[PDB]
């Protein structure tokens, strides 16, 4: 899932 400032799913 989305981890602010680290990982943003498509």
């Amino acid at each position: 899932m989305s981890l602010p400032g680290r990982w943003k799913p498509k």
């Epitope: 602010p4 680290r6 943003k8 799913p9």
Partner: antibody, heavy 125, light 112 residues
Framework: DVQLVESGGGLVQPGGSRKLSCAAS????????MHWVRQAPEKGLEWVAY????????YYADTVKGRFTISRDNPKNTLFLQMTSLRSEDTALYYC??????????????????WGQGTSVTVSS | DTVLTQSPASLAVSLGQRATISCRAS??????????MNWFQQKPGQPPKLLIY???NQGSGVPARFSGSGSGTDFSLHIHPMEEDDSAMYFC?????????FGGGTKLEIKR
């Protein structure tokens, strides 16, 4: 291309306050989350604070959480770090680094891809 | 926080040889099939530069001599062949959890 220039550092008395700026150019500033990282004399890198492109998400290091405030002014292409209650242990070179997104077939991994030269903060009387 | 133990604290490698730096995480940095492990090169008086992101992906202007491997809590940065301007401080970092953490760093010097 992408240029980040910090400024505002200097000598500050313990318990003092100081605002640092980070001027961005060469990219679409409003599109990137930004960080402040510090490096104490003869020390490693220590993450200080983070701010999303639109300021919705802000994260701080525990030792900084109450005294330091991170903010940005997208129209002016500038990132700030407001420091208060400066402690000797805040003496360090402060860098602003960009949070660059890298595209994968499934998402975008973020990392501090560009760093500035930094500003030196000396907390001493 | 997930603590990163970086070894060795320093090393000296001859030109042409491989220099490997290791980094152990207190907690796995794996997240959704990826490893949130990054490595930076910091030249004296200079800002850090991204080398490897996501454990084994080379950054923008990064030579093929710079590689990275590992997953979970076990990670290494490899530099082969070692060249003249490689002498510098290197740091691992995890981007899975907040706060972002860095290894203690390792001073890589040319053994002459």
């Amino acid at each position: 291309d992408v240029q980040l220039v910090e400024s505002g550092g200097g000598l500050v008395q313990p318990g003092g306050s100081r605002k640092l700026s980070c001027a961005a150019s060469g990219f679409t500033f409003m599109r990137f989350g930004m960080h402040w990282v510090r490096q104490a004399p003869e020390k490693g890198l220590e993450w200080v604070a983070y701010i999303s492109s639109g300021s919705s998400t802000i994260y701080y290091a525990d030792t900084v959480k109450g005294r330091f405030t991170i903010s940005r002014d997208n129209p002016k292409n500038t990132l700030f770090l407001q420091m208060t209650s400066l402690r000797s242990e805040d003496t360090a070179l402060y860098y602003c680094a960009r949070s660059g997104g890298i595209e994968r077939y499934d998402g975008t991994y973020y990392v501090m891809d560009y760093w500035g030269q930094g500003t030196s903060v000396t907390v001493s009387s | 926080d997930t603590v990163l133990t970086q070894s060795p604290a320093s090393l000296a490698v001859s030109l042409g040889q491989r220099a490997t730096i290791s980094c152990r995480a207190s907690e796995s940095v794996d997240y959704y099939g990826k490893s949130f492990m990054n490595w930076f090169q910091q030249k004296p008086g200079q800002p850090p530069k991204l080398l490897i992101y996501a454990a084994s992906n080379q950054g923008s202007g990064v030579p093929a001599r710079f590689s990275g491997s590992g997953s979970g809590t076990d990670f290494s940065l490899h530099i082969h062949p070692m060249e003249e301007d490689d002498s510098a401080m290197y740091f691992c970092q995890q981007s899975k959890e907040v706060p972002w953490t860095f290894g203690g760093g390792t001073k890589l010097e040319i053994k002459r």
